[PDB]
Design an enzyme around this catalytic site. Structure first.
Site, PDB file in Angstrom:
ATOM      1  CB  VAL A  80      -0.920   0.040   1.247  1.00 13.03           C
ATOM      2  CG1 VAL A  80      -2.051  -0.962   1.084  1.00 13.03           C
ATOM      3  CG2 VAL A  80      -0.120  -0.275   2.511  1.00 13.03           C
ATOM      4  CB  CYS A  81       1.931   3.583  -2.165  1.00 11.84           C
ATOM      5  SG  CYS A  81       2.657   2.070  -2.873  1.00 11.84           S
ATOM      6  CB  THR A  82       1.333   7.608   1.570  1.00 13.11           C
ATOM      7  OG1 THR A  82       2.716   7.989   1.505  1.00 13.11           O
ATOM      8  CG2 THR A  82       1.161   6.501   2.612  1.00 13.11           C
ATOM      9  CB  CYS A  95       5.345   1.635  -1.464  1.00 13.87           C
ATOM     10  SG  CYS A  95       4.653   2.472  -2.908  1.00 13.87           S
TER      11      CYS A  95
END
Lengths: 160, 160, 161, 160
Positions: free
Chosen positions: C46-48, C52
């Site tokens: 999951v990344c912002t 990640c």
């Protein structure tokens, strides 16, 4: 055998806290005794298809009698059940299938499980006579607690 | 009666969700099977003078084997237990006292309750042989789960 | 066709990590609400704004008072592995045949080249069958607020008295 | 004396149903024990001008500990109080002023009445140590049950 009129058989079972509870010793307390048998705790009540855990069993606290719910579940389990539903009354454990046999209110084999308490209701007067009795062979058939409360208060008011 | 080396007896029990679970069918999955028997759910573990519900049973999830906790409790109860402790493994209900008898791991009469599962631990290899076994007659005696996890991964890896 | 808020959630049956069939309605019939979580793929990060990581707080859904069912087109074997490695208490169902992701209209046409991937979606179904909550994004690397879902889940659970 | 860190003194009192209740035997059950002392049942809680019978004591049923409300009132009286407020927990009768003296939580002379339980709250760990303590000399000073529930669950969770 136990049915309307007949005198209810004495017995002793452990409650959520393993304290023994004798029937006659409770009737000896002055109020009527409401006995509620149920298959299993943490078990849902359904209809044609709709199943929920909306069990208005806590309404029996409104009755003017000593309520005693009984299932073959263990004390530890009932204790858990009692605490989670903030039930004021006592839940007795018929772990050894004694009472459900004594009162002839047991399912031979429910969903594979053998010797389960059937959903039954008995109201015993302070003397020892069955003033009320209701039983169904349909486990997912929740009782009308509001009803039992009435009959219970009726019988209670009877002894004036 | 069962003992190390001997081949573990097959069996089938319902899990929290009433789904049948056959032992051999699980061993047939490829990983070893860790069987944990316990008296009752919502039951506390106690030391010399202490007692608490600090049961590190969820650590068995660290083991590289299919874990199967078994107690005579009902599926509805185990389900409640499983969800509250966020236990990843399956809990099987030996409501009919079959398996606890099959494996000879039962208390005659615990605190009054008859035929309760003793605290026992069995690790079975994908073939069916008991690679590990531990049992105590002291119910309030919590097992060393970190330990069983080790022996479990050892047996798992030993299968290179 | 399409499942939308308020409307009734379509029934279906998928295999779980252990190939055991799991029918939606049969689960709703158990008494609690059902929380459905769709995700692109297992062992996927999951990344912002850039960072990640594999810090996926998905296990927090175990805090919810509903039957949680995580779904992806991954295989049972794969999901089982993912399940065991993250000590996830709930079930992961395999939509290997793209059935459900189509039934719920929650699929990516072509993600990074991969065709027919589950979109990140969340559905909370009441024991009767009505969609009480729904959340979806077209951004795959967009992790959901599980803490959030858990409260809407408990709310919906409690509002059932 | 009975203060933090110190170990709570054992004792046995009857409950609404005259069943003896030993403190240590309860701590031995696994959960922490919350002791609540109160002047008298059917007694109101006030401020500086207003009084009411709005006593949120039933909120202690939310705590993950065995709650034990104690007053010098009689079992028959507490039983009536318990049933009327659908209180799930137990009420123990210190009719002989034993415990209130043992815990040093008693009013010398309240409104003329001699040897009345002061409004006190003790939380004891399954081992026997006082993890929490709160007392006031103002009888019409209702405690923050919501609060006690927090501290209770905190202490409960601490033993993990």
């Amino acid at each position: 055998l136990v049915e309307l009129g007949e005198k209810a058989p004495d017995f002793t079972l452990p409650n959520q806290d393993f304290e023994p509870v004798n029937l006659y010793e409770v009737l000896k307390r002055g109020r009527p005794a409401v006995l509620i048998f149920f298959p299993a705790a943490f078990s849902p009540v359904c209809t044609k298809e709709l199943c929920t855990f909306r069990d208005k069993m806590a309404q029996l606290e409104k009755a003017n009698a000593e309520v005693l719910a009984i299932s073959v579940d263990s004390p530890w389990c009932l204790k858990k059940f009692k605490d989670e539903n903030r039930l004021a009354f006592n839940l007795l454990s018929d772990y050894n299938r004694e009472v459900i046999k004594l009162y002839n209110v047991y399912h031979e084999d429910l969903k594979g499980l053998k010797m389960v308490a059937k959903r039954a209701v008995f109201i015993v007067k302070p003397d020892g006579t069955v003033a009320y009795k209701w039983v169904t062979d349909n486990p997912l058939n929740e009782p009308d607690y509001d009803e039992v409360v009435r009959e219970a208060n009726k019988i209670a008011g009877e002894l004036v």
